[PDB]
Write a protein that binds this ligand. Structure first.
Ligand SMILES: [Zn+2]
Ligand SMILES: [Zn+2]
Lengths: 192, 191
């Protein structure tokens, strides 16, 4: 039976997720959880998913952003956002750190808070160490949109949601997503 | 006819609303806007409504708490929230300021942001000067829930929503409303 995404309010979403013992990652139990996360991420088209989002208090995140996913997306947007596809990625016990001080502003959403969006500031490029599916130690360097997904998801592992880190008065309904940014609001884009 | 409530996103909601020229408050025009606000506020049952919430960039707010509105809520809650009913109140060019440093934590919602709630800190007792429906100069002192509504609504007049004022990780789906506050969160109620 495939789990359902839990929403804002459920504590596992706002509480720090504990590590998976490296060596259990190759387990049918954890492997199962990972396959679930991937199935859920794909089943309601999104590009990232963190364990807590399915009631699993473990430090695990998954992400994928496909050519197709992007196929439908304003060429200009794809540009400014610097969104490039990348193969399905799984990371247990990830540890994210910014590679530089360049940032960017764009709208973010979460399957745990649907119907809404909000512009949030993220580092343009980052590095992430941790383990993959088979429990193999890895290091990942990303930038652009993929870098944003990584941050969003990892945040989930420490019980943080975008709504608590969003730009004032940008929060909005999906239907209002592309509405003039109110006077005083920083402008979407990146330093470099 | 009647205007619809604008959902978060619409710029009018996040931009400071201009004052209404006293002396015009008695205007047939402004009187219409206030009647609209009251009708909408009551239509989608609510206790507070600000002009911007209907697309009107003016400093006007309307509010009222009914024993019927209070009816569908446990008394154990209504007590803790110091929630009492109060007559329909209309305030143009309201100016709020706290009467003390005592605050309270409870869950708030906004018709411009439905399906969700979040705990927010508010001053327990406040004062509000401004004009009433007929343009009459007034001063209002309140506490408990009515004090909160007044804060919530006035904030609107400055383009501010609770979501940009909420307690970290208390923001939730109206359904999960009765779920536990996360470890590290303050407690609800007064100090
Ligand atoms: Zn998310
Ligand atoms: Zn409101």
């Amino acid at each position: 039976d495939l789990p359902e995404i839990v929403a804002s309010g459920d504590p596992v979403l706002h509480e720090k997720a504990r590590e998976v013992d490296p060596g259990e990652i190759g387990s049918e139990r954890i492997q199962k959880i990972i396959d679930d996360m991937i199935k859920v991420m794909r089943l309601a088209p999104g590009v990232g998913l963190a364990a807590p989002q399915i009631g699993v208090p473990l430090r695990i995140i998954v992400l994928e952003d496909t050519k197709e996913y992007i196929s439908y997306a304003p060429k200009e947007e794809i540009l400014a956002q610097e969104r490039r596809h990348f193969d399905l990625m799984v990371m247990v016990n990830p540890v994210l750190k910014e590679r530089s001080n360049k940032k960017a502003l764009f709208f973010e959403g979460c399957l745990s808070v649907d119907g809404f969006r909000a512009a949030v500031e993220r580092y343009l490029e980052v590095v992430v160490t941790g383990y993959d599916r088979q429990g193999k130690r890895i290091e990942v360097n990303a930038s652009g949109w993929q870098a944003r997904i990584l941050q969003h998801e990892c945040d989930h592992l420490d019980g943080n949601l975008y709504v608590d880190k969003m730009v004032p008065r940008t929060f909005r309904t999906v239907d209002n997503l592309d509405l003039p940014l109110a006077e005083g609001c920083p402008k979407l884009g990146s330093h470099h």
